[PDB]
């Protein structure tokens, strides 16, 4: 149950809410350990 997924609309019908995408995408990340709800990406693409 790692929060290393939910990369926006990659494999989810995500509308805009980052969760583990949008925020990271700004820098260029797509996966990381989650805290509370938002994943703090620790891997850049």
């Amino acid at each position: 149950a790692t929060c290393d997924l939910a990369s926006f609309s990659s494999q989810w019908v995500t509308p805009n809410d980052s969760l583990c995408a949008a925020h990271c995408l700004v820098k260029g990340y797509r996966g990381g350990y989650c805290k509370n709800k938002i994943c703090h990406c620790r891997d850049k693409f």
Side-chain angles (χ1 to χ4, degrees):
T2 42
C3 300
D4 191 62
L5 294 175
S7 320
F8 198 45
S9 309
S10 193
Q11 295 286 176
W12 274 78
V13 65
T14 316
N16 179 57
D17 309 67
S18 52
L19 296 177
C20 201
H23 275 309
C24 305
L25 301 183
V26 178
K27 291 189 177 59
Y29 296 53
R30 45 75 53 69
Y33 35 75
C34 49
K35 283 184 175 62
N36 183 293
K37 280 188 182 304
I38 304 300
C39 91
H40 287 296
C41 299
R42 47 93 193 80
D43 194 13
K44 46 143 179 55
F45 53 60

PDB file of all heavy atoms in Angstrom, residues 3 32-40:
ATOM      1  N   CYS A   3       2.415   4.714  -1.244  1.00  0.00           N
ATOM      2  CA  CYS A   3       1.863   5.859  -1.960  1.00  0.00           C
ATOM      3  C   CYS A   3       2.757   6.245  -3.134  1.00  0.00           C
ATOM      4  O   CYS A   3       2.933   7.422  -3.432  1.00  0.00           O
ATOM      5  CB  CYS A   3       1.701   7.050  -1.016  1.00  0.00           C
ATOM      6  SG  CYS A   3       0.598   6.746   0.402  1.00  0.00           S
ATOM      7  N   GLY A  32       6.573   9.147  -4.083  1.00  0.00           N
ATOM      8  CA  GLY A  32       7.254   9.388  -2.828  1.00  0.00           C
ATOM      9  C   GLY A  32       6.425   8.991  -1.624  1.00  0.00           C
ATOM     10  O   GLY A  32       5.223   8.752  -1.738  1.00  0.00           O
ATOM     11  N   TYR A  33       7.075   8.928  -0.467  1.00  0.00           N
ATOM     12  CA  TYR A  33       6.409   8.570   0.782  1.00  0.00           C
ATOM     13  C   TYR A  33       5.359   9.618   1.150  1.00  0.00           C
ATOM     14  O   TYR A  33       5.633  10.819   1.169  1.00  0.00           O
ATOM     15  CB  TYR A  33       7.448   8.399   1.900  1.00  0.00           C
ATOM     16  CG  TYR A  33       8.620   9.357   1.805  1.00  0.00           C
ATOM     17  CD1 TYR A  33       8.482  10.696   2.143  1.00  0.00           C
ATOM     18  CD2 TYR A  33       9.865   8.916   1.370  1.00  0.00           C
ATOM     19  CE1 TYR A  33       9.548  11.568   2.049  1.00  0.00           C
ATOM     20  CE2 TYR A  33      10.935   9.785   1.273  1.00  0.00           C
ATOM     21  CZ  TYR A  33      10.771  11.110   1.613  1.00  0.00           C
ATOM     22  OH  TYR A  33      11.831  11.982   1.509  1.00  0.00           O
ATOM     23  N   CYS A  34       4.147   9.161   1.407  1.00  0.00           N
ATOM     24  CA  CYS A  34       3.043  10.049   1.737  1.00  0.00           C
ATOM     25  C   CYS A  34       3.016  10.439   3.210  1.00  0.00           C
ATOM     26  O   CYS A  34       3.439   9.676   4.083  1.00  0.00           O
ATOM     27  CB  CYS A  34       1.719   9.393   1.350  1.00  0.00           C
ATOM     28  SG  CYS A  34       1.545   7.675   1.936  1.00  0.00           S
ATOM     29  N   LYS A  35       2.482  11.624   3.470  1.00  0.00           N
ATOM     30  CA  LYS A  35       2.335  12.141   4.820  1.00  0.00           C
ATOM     31  C   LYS A  35       0.956  12.764   4.937  1.00  0.00           C
ATOM     32  O   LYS A  35       0.634  13.685   4.185  1.00  0.00           O
ATOM     33  CB  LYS A  35       3.412  13.180   5.151  1.00  0.00           C
ATOM     34  CG  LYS A  35       4.773  12.576   5.455  1.00  0.00           C
ATOM     35  CD  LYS A  35       5.772  13.640   5.882  1.00  0.00           C
ATOM     36  CE  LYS A  35       7.094  13.024   6.315  1.00  0.00           C
ATOM     37  NZ  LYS A  35       7.752  12.273   5.212  1.00  0.00           N
ATOM     38  N   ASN A  36       0.145  12.228   5.844  1.00  0.00           N
ATOM     39  CA  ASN A  36      -1.236  12.681   6.058  1.00  0.00           C
ATOM     40  C   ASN A  36      -2.125  12.250   4.890  1.00  0.00           C
ATOM     41  O   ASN A  36      -3.043  11.450   5.069  1.00  0.00           O
ATOM     42  CB  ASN A  36      -1.303  14.205   6.257  1.00  0.00           C
ATOM     43  CG  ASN A  36      -2.708  14.703   6.561  1.00  0.00           C
ATOM     44  OD1 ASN A  36      -3.603  14.649   5.717  1.00  0.00           O
ATOM     45  ND2 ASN A  36      -2.907  15.201   7.769  1.00  0.00           N
ATOM     46  N   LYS A  37      -1.827  12.759   3.696  1.00  0.00           N
ATOM     47  CA  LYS A  37      -2.577  12.421   2.487  1.00  0.00           C
ATOM     48  C   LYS A  37      -1.728  12.634   1.239  1.00  0.00           C
ATOM     49  O   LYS A  37      -1.759  11.826   0.313  1.00  0.00           O
ATOM     50  CB  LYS A  37      -3.862  13.253   2.368  1.00  0.00           C
ATOM     51  CG  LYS A  37      -5.007  12.733   3.209  1.00  0.00           C
ATOM     52  CD  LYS A  37      -6.301  13.461   2.909  1.00  0.00           C
ATOM     53  CE  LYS A  37      -7.422  12.961   3.798  1.00  0.00           C
ATOM     54  NZ  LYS A  37      -7.617  11.490   3.675  1.00  0.00           N
ATOM     55  N   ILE A  38      -0.978  13.727   1.214  1.00  0.00           N
ATOM     56  CA  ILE A  38      -0.135  14.039   0.070  1.00  0.00           C
ATOM     57  C   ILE A  38       1.189  13.295   0.155  1.00  0.00           C
ATOM     58  O   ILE A  38       1.821  13.251   1.214  1.00  0.00           O
ATOM     59  CB  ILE A  38       0.139  15.558  -0.028  1.00  0.00           C
ATOM     60  CG1 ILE A  38      -1.181  16.336  -0.088  1.00  0.00           C
ATOM     61  CG2 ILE A  38       1.000  15.880  -1.244  1.00  0.00           C
ATOM     62  CD1 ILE A  38      -2.052  15.974  -1.274  1.00  0.00           C
ATOM     63  N   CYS A  39       1.613  12.717  -0.955  1.00  0.00           N
ATOM     64  CA  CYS A  39       2.868  12.000  -0.982  1.00  0.00           C
ATOM     65  C   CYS A  39       3.999  12.981  -1.247  1.00  0.00           C
ATOM     66  O   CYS A  39       3.903  13.834  -2.131  1.00  0.00           O
ATOM     67  CB  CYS A  39       2.858  10.892  -2.049  1.00  0.00           C
ATOM     68  SG  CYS A  39       3.461  11.404  -3.692  1.00  0.00           S
ATOM     69  N   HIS A  40       5.069  12.859  -0.493  1.00  0.00           N
ATOM     70  CA  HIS A  40       6.213  13.721  -0.678  1.00  0.00           C
ATOM     71  C   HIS A  40       7.209  12.991  -1.551  1.00  0.00           C
ATOM     72  O   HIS A  40       8.031  12.205  -1.070  1.00  0.00           O
ATOM     73  CB  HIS A  40       6.819  14.135   0.658  1.00  0.00           C
ATOM     74  CG  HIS A  40       5.978  15.133   1.394  1.00  0.00           C
ATOM     75  ND1 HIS A  40       5.721  16.402   0.918  1.00  0.00           N
ATOM     76  CD2 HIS A  40       5.316  15.038   2.571  1.00  0.00           C
ATOM     77  CE1 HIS A  40       4.947  17.041   1.772  1.00  0.00           C
ATOM     78  NE2 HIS A  40       4.686  16.236   2.782  1.00  0.00           N
TER      79      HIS A  40
END
